[PDB]
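Open question from group meeting: does this chain pack into something compact, or does most of it stay loose? Before anyone orders reagents, we agreed to write out a predicted structure and look at it together. Recording both the input and the output here so the notebook holds the full record.
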Amino acid sequence: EDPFTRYALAQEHLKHDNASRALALFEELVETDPDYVGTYYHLGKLYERLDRTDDAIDTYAQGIEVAREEGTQKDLSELQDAKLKAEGLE
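Structure tokens returned:
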């Protein structure tokens, strides 16, 4: 029940094409441990695949708020990049 533990957990699923499980964990993580930056990028990239793109953007935006305050440039960058690309779709 540890942030990284389930994060990595959610991450293996993603690899083994178990997106529904990956998403469950991700959403949970985002509300239990909201300032754990890593979740936001994969959740949004998942929302996009799930055709809930607009949801993905509110997540990239939520991620970018915590990343400025509690993240690292690497984290801030991937989110910023992700967000701008989602937007350049429609």
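Observations to bring back to the group:
Residues 1-90 form a domain with the Serine Threonine Protein Phosphatase 5, Tetratricopeptide repeat fold (CATH 1.25.40.10).
The helical segments are 3-15, 19-32, 38-49, 53-70, 73-87.
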